[PDB]
Scaffold this active site. Structure first.
Site, PDB file in Angstrom:
ATOM      1  N   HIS A 644      27.761  56.980   1.742  1.00 28.61           N
ATOM      2  CA  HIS A 644      27.224  58.304   1.452  1.00 28.61           C
ATOM      3  C   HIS A 644      27.652  58.699   0.049  1.00 28.61           C
ATOM      4  O   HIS A 644      28.847  58.868  -0.211  1.00 28.61           O
ATOM      5  CB  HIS A 644      27.712  59.332   2.478  1.00 28.61           C
ATOM      6  CG  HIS A 644      27.663  58.846   3.893  1.00 28.61           C
ATOM      7  ND1 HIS A 644      28.568  57.935   4.398  1.00 28.61           N
ATOM      8  CD2 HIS A 644      26.818  59.137   4.909  1.00 28.61           C
ATOM      9  CE1 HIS A 644      28.281  57.690   5.664  1.00 28.61           C
ATOM     10  NE2 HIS A 644      27.224  58.406   5.999  1.00 28.61           N
ATOM     11  N   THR A 645      26.680  58.846  -0.851  1.00 29.64           N
ATOM     12  CA  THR A 645      26.987  59.173  -2.238  1.00 29.64           C
ATOM     13  C   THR A 645      27.529  60.585  -2.410  1.00 29.64           C
ATOM     14  O   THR A 645      28.016  60.909  -3.498  1.00 29.64           O
ATOM     15  CB  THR A 645      25.746  58.993  -3.122  1.00 29.64           C
ATOM     16  OG1 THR A 645      26.063  59.364  -4.468  1.00 29.64           O
ATOM     17  CG2 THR A 645      24.590  59.850  -2.628  1.00 29.64           C
ATOM     18  N   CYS A 646      27.454  61.429  -1.379  1.00 31.50           N
ATOM     19  CA  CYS A 646      28.046  62.759  -1.477  1.00 31.50           C
ATOM     20  C   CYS A 646      29.504  62.671  -1.900  1.00 31.50           C
ATOM     21  O   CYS A 646      29.965  63.449  -2.744  1.00 31.50           O
ATOM     22  CB  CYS A 646      27.921  63.491  -0.142  1.00 31.50           C
ATOM     23  SG  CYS A 646      29.190  64.748   0.134  1.00 31.50           S
ATOM     24  N   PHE A 647      30.248  61.726  -1.321  1.00 26.51           N
ATOM     25  CA  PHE A 647      31.614  61.462  -1.752  1.00 26.51           C
ATOM     26  C   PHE A 647      31.911  59.966  -1.792  1.00 26.51           C
ATOM     27  O   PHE A 647      33.084  59.576  -1.757  1.00 26.51           O
ATOM     28  CB  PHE A 647      32.620  62.170  -0.839  1.00 26.51           C
ATOM     29  CG  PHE A 647      32.498  61.791   0.609  1.00 26.51           C
ATOM     30  CD1 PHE A 647      31.611  62.454   1.440  1.00 26.51           C
ATOM     31  CD2 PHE A 647      33.274  60.775   1.141  1.00 26.51           C
ATOM     32  CE1 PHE A 647      31.498  62.109   2.774  1.00 26.51           C
ATOM     33  CE2 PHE A 647      33.167  60.426   2.473  1.00 26.51           C
ATOM     34  CZ  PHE A 647      32.277  61.093   3.290  1.00 26.51           C
TER      35      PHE A 647
END
EC number: 2.3.2.26
Length: 679
Positions: A644-647
């Site tokens: 997940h590129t969010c974090f």
């Protein structure tokens, strides 16, 4: 009577079966030329005489027997036809077909010929494919084995001509929709086939595991054409859908697999060899391999860019001019007003006659190369609200639903819409980034569901609990998506009864997919489509489909680079020691991995490019600083990984050793759509 004296025509036919003749072109060519005329009318006459038939009783329109039909096509497998004899033998057979009582005989004879011929191959192909990778590197192959593939008097050419004529019989003229493609499948099915195809895979994958002075994997060129002829019309579409799990083993059982499940399972086990044939002979995309275009997944990046280049528009005559005098401090608006309508169709044909304010011609012409870059830097123009720097992270720009406030955003989109194409129209690498969802609006593809989690947890968190655990109609959450309209926040009915219809266990996918679509499609997307309208106007949608949503970024931004040490050290491990010793061999192979192979990997966990600088310790995402930490997650241990590129969550289900994790990661990066996207 023997019909010899009761019909002049049979005299000629009696020539065909004379060894003294049929060993020359002119004789065969001239006799075929003669027969082209009678058969032309002969087919017309009887077919054209239904009621006023007073001519068959005069000429005695012959009746066609077994040996009347077989004799015409008994020479298509002869050692004298050139690429003039066939082009007329085909027309002879076609014209004759229309006479009654022939089609069945033609088909029966053709299948008999096919079964007769597709039995010497395997007796010989096994000989060859058993030789490659069996002596040494630097040795040679006994020509006799190759002597059967090199001469034009081979067997393969016959196995191509036969299928060509079968298709032509069931293809030429008529109506493609009126065609009966189903039965076409059976005819090849009636042919023994099978072993030959399956025994070929042991020859088209036997060159990737050896080296030889002869090498020359083009010798088995004829067949592969036929193997694509068979699939030419079957479906070659929507059958590619597979994936699910990583097989990690070849096997390649091809006993029968019918004739419609032979295309996509094949051509995948052999991708390296196939790719390393176009880059050596790029003209092999307008003929023998012309069909592969309908399999974008099987073409690597490099060949795709070239095939895009030459075909693009290499038919113009220079560019007249473009007298634009931007002062270098206005640029954007000055060109938005100065280019007005510079022959939109031929607007490409305009060189940038632009100087900063008073400069001259130095460092060669076209110094606007930087003008575009600064334009891209100035294209964002943070003062204007045309876009948003992806609140999730400044590194990218966002559709910015608040883009409608700008009074004259309309014409602006077309300018940048076509201007970006101009860089594509040339060889430039201007820097720009719009995240995966924006790209997907261009390539025909629906919105993705998993993107919400990373793109915007806000609304995904609103549905993070839902779709599992608590999805039992316990909540109501009336259908239709929340609507922002710079005023009354009236939830707009997605479906006709979105407000009335509740999102029950039945109305799950419709409501969820439309809610996701609303954010990414019902937004200024319509206004941004203006950006696409010019881009679509400059380049057709079909002209871009060869790429995918993922690689359009690489087309826009120059192939990004990346080091190893920074990603090696600036790391983090959650309940892990950075690997199971398997990522270790991949950790070394990253150097082996192609820059595209490496570059695509970064997009999986970030989807932004724009190497962060500072050594990857600078990981400004949503929180301003981050550190991608691998996670175990105690999943299936064989399911594909995730992140997940969010974090930069990252994941690694416990795999075993070489092959498994290697190819799993390879598929994941190549997965693109249907993984982290639509799925």
């Amino acid at each position: 009577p023997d019909k010899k004296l009761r019909w002049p025509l049979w005299h000629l036919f009696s020539l065909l079966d004379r060894k003294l003749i049929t060993d020359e072109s002119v004789l065969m060519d001239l006799l075929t030329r003669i027969l082209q005329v009678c058969t032309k009318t002969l087919a017309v006459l009887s077919t054209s005489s239904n009621g006023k038939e007073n001519l068959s009783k005069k000429f005695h329109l012959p009746s066609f027997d077994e040996d009347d039909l077989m004799k015409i096509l008994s020479i298509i497998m002869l050692d004298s036809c050139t690429t003039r004899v066939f082009q007329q033998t085909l027309n002879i057979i076609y014209n004759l077909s229309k006479l009654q009582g022939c089609m069945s005989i033609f088909t029966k004879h053709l299948v008999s010929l096919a079964i007769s011929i597709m039995s010497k191959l395997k007796s010989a192909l096994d000989g060859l494919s058993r030789e490659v990778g069996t002596i040494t590197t630097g040795m040679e192959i006994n020509s006799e084995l190759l002597q059967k593939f090199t001469l034009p008097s081979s067997d393969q050419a016959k196995l191509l001509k036969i299928l060509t004529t079968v298709d032509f019989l069931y293809t030429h003229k008529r109506k493609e929709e009126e065609r009966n493609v189903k039965d076409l499948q059976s005819l090849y099915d009636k042919m023994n086939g099978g072993p030959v195809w399956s025994s070929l895979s042991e020859c088209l994958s036997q060159f990737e595991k050896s080296q030889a002075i002869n090498t020359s994997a083009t010798i088995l060129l004829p067949l592969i054409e036929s193997l694509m002829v068979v699939c030419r019309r079957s479906d070659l579409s929507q059958n590619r859908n597979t994936a699910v799990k990583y097989e990690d083993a070849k096997l390649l059982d091809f006993s029968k697999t019918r004739v419609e499940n032979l295309f996509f399972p094949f051509t995948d086990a052999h991708k390296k060899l196939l790719n390393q044939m176009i880059r050596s002979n790029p003209k092999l995309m307008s003929g023998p391999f012309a069909l592969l275009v309908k399999n974008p997944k099987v073409l690597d990046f490099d060949n795709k860019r070239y095939f895009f280049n030459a075909k693009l528009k290499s038919d113009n005559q220079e560019r007249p001019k473009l007298p634009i005098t931007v002062r270098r401090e206005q640029v954007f608006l000055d060109s938005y007003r100065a280019l007005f309508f510079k022959t939109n169709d031929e607007i490409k044909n305009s060189k940038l006659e632009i100087t900063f304010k008073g400069e001259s011609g130095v460092d060669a012409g076209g110094v606007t190369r930087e003008w575009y870059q600064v334009l891209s830097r100035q294209m964002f123009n943070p003062d204007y609200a045309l876009f948003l720097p992806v609140p999730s992270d400044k590194t990218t720009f966002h559709p910015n639903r608040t883009s409608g406030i700008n009074p004259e955003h309309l014409s602006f989109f077309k300018f940048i819409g076509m201007i970006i194409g101009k860089a594509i129209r040339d060889q430039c690498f201007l820097d720009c980034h719009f995240s995966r969802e924006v790209y997907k609006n261009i390539l025909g593809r629906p919105v993705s569901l998993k993107d919400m989690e990373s793109l915007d947890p806000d609304y995904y968190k609103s549905l993070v609990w839902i779709l599992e655990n608590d999805i039992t109609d316990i909540i109501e959450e009336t259908f239709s998506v929340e609507t922002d309209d710079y005023g009354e926040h009236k939830v707009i009915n997605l479906i006709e009864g979105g407000k009335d219809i509740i999102v029950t266990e039945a109305n799950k996918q419709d409501y969820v997919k439309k809610v996701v679509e609303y954010k990414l499609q019902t937004s200024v997307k319509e206004q941004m489509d203006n950006f696409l309208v010019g881009f679509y106007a400059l380049i057709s949608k079909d002209l871009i489909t060869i790429f995918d949503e993922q690689e359009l970024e690489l087309l826009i931004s120059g192939l990004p680079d990346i080091d190893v040490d920074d990603w090696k050290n600036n790391t983090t491990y959650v309940n892990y020691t950075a690997t199971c010793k398997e990522v270790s061999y991949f950790w070394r192979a990253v150097r082996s991995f192609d820059a595209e192979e490496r570059a695509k990997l970064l997009q999986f966990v970030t989807g932004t490019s724009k190497v962060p600088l500072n050594g990857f310790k600078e990981l400004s995402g949503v929180n301003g600083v981050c550190k991608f930490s691998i996670h175990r997650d105690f999943g299936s241990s064989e399911r594909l990984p995730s992140s997940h590129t969010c974090f930069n969550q990252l994941n690694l289900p416990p795999y075993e050793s070489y092959e498994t994790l290697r190819g799993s990661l390879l598929l994941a990066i190549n997965e693109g759509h249907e993984g982290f996207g639509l799925a």
